[PDB]
Design an enzyme around this catalytic site. Structure first.
Site, PDB file in Angstrom:
ATOM      1  CB  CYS C 148     -19.458 -27.445 -43.576  1.00  0.00           C
ATOM      2  SG  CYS C 148     -20.803 -26.482 -44.221  1.00  0.00           S
ATOM      3  NE  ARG C 168     -22.019 -24.906 -37.231  1.00  0.00           N
ATOM      4  CZ  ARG C 168     -21.060 -25.798 -37.048  1.00  0.00           C
ATOM      5  NH1 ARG C 168     -20.907 -26.790 -37.919  1.00  0.00           N
ATOM      6  NH2 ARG C 168     -20.275 -25.703 -35.982  1.00  0.00           N
ATOM      7  CG  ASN C 179     -16.817 -14.735 -41.591  1.00  0.00           C
ATOM      8  OD1 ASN C 179     -17.090 -14.762 -40.390  1.00  0.00           O
ATOM      9  ND2 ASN C 179     -15.967 -15.596 -42.154  1.00  0.00           N
TER      10      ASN C 179
END
Lengths: 263, 8, 263
Positions: C148, C168, C179
């Site tokens: 992911c 990540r 975000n």
């Protein structure tokens, strides 16, 4: 520069002061805080905690067990910390593969997450996808696409290997000190076979918690002063991750406070 | 309450 | 009590000072730090950044698009926010299901990660497994078991819903402010629908980076003082996650510094 165990001590202290009551799945009480992070340098030191004696032999032995992909408790029985089907081993080495027997041949069956991490470090050290997951075995028959318990992301810059462990929950008293040592060891192993130096271990938690009956022991541990972290020596040039044996490792200058039994 | 490609 | 945007600014500042040079996938240079975390309160405020104007309308619009599981680009080009098969929506609503067309009926096909998060919050709010993942669509045809790009874990105590996003990698200049707003909005929506109050949004990064050409703009942004965060109001009682429309949301008291163009 401040001793890295101070982060672990500050997290305990923050949970005791600011944590809220929350039950675990068995209805056992904890004090809980959501979202935490600590960074432990792996440069010329090894983060085996010193405010209590951590059972390093069991850290090593159980990691080595995970690395061979074992679903057999006997290979971990008469060693220290006391037919399976899952565990972190089978998922690290053979993800999604048809399980049949524990004495069965699984060579090249499923996805080898660990070898894939190693190969990626070698073929593309800049990669942002250097990720390996572990599952609580009880979740596997529970639902399709079950969430991992832990995600570990590796990172390389300037010939240093860093590792971040995300755990969806962390038992601060028992599990966390053992996991810090465990993933720091893993990082040392992978660095060694990829010709990098260990960098940082970053430990990130979702539900960071203390079981109610660890409160008094941890309160005593909080008043102990950390001693300089030990060093970890790898005694042999080792070529592949599967070749490591317990005897290739020596912890040096480990000088901890007495054992604390939690529970 | 999930994660990681279709085969588990 | 210190303004939460200070965390974001301190992170930019730390990468500028301590970040190391690292190329991305295309050989484009960044300044990079591995392992970061910030906490943004969602209690009676909403973390839409004020040191530059964030395009809130596109946050909302793109999120609603994801919530319906769309693999159609022009449902996101007729909205002025600027044939697929994957992007975060199809994985959020229909994970692992056989893809055919984009005008196809996928009702009850694959795992519904988002509905499952909502149901678990209702049936078991103590659950430590309330997790939903998103993938970069480039990764899907690239390997088995692709990792992911982002994992999101929800958490409930005392009638408050918190969210932790692990990415990540994080583009600090462009992607990160967007975000933060996006997952903070998602938490507000899931809270509203489960009869909980928003708690904290915790943002955790692996490779936190700044593209070299964003350095000068960000250096200017770093001298702007944050203004009190706005508030987000939901304008009717909404019963199911699929029922939200753009017009149900109003941002109030948003008073940002001028737009900064980066890329």
């Amino acid at each position: 520069p401040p001793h890295g165990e101070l982060q672990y001590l500050g997290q305990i202290q923050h949970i005791l002061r600011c944590g809220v009551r929350k039950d675990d799945r068995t209805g056992t009480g904890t004090l809980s805080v959501f979202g935490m992070q600590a960074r432990y340098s792996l440069r010329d030191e090894f983060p085996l905690l010193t405010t209590k004696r951590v059972f390093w032999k069991g850290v090593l032995e159980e990691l080595l067990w995970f690395i061979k992909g074992s679903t057999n408790a006997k290979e971990l029985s008469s060693k220290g910390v006391k037919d399976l089907g899952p565990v972190y081993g089978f998922q690290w080495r053979h993800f999604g593969a048809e399980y049949r027997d524990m004495e069965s041949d699984y060579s090249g069956q499923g996805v080898d997450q660990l070898q894939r991490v190693i190969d990626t470090i070698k073929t593309n050290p800049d990669d942002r996808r250097i990720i390996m997951c572990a599952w609580n075995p009880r979740d596997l028959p529970l639902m399709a696409l079950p969430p991992c318990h832990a995600l570990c992301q590796f990172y390389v810059v300037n010939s240093e290997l860093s590792c971040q462990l995300y755990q969806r929950s962390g038992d601060m008293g028992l599990g966390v000190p053992f996991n810090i040592a465990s993933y720091a060891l893993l990082t040392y192993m992978i660095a060694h076979i990829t010709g990098l130096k260990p960098g940082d271990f970053i430990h990130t938690l979702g539900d960071a918690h203390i079981y109610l009956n660890h409160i008094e022991p941890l309160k005593i541990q909080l008043q102990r002063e950390p001693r300089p972290f030990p060093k970890l020596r790898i005694l042999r040039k080792v070529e592949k991750i599967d070749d490591f044996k317990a005897e290739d490792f020596q912890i040096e200058g480990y000088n901890p406070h007495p054992t604390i039994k939690m529970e | 309450l999930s994660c990681q490609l279709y085969q588990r």
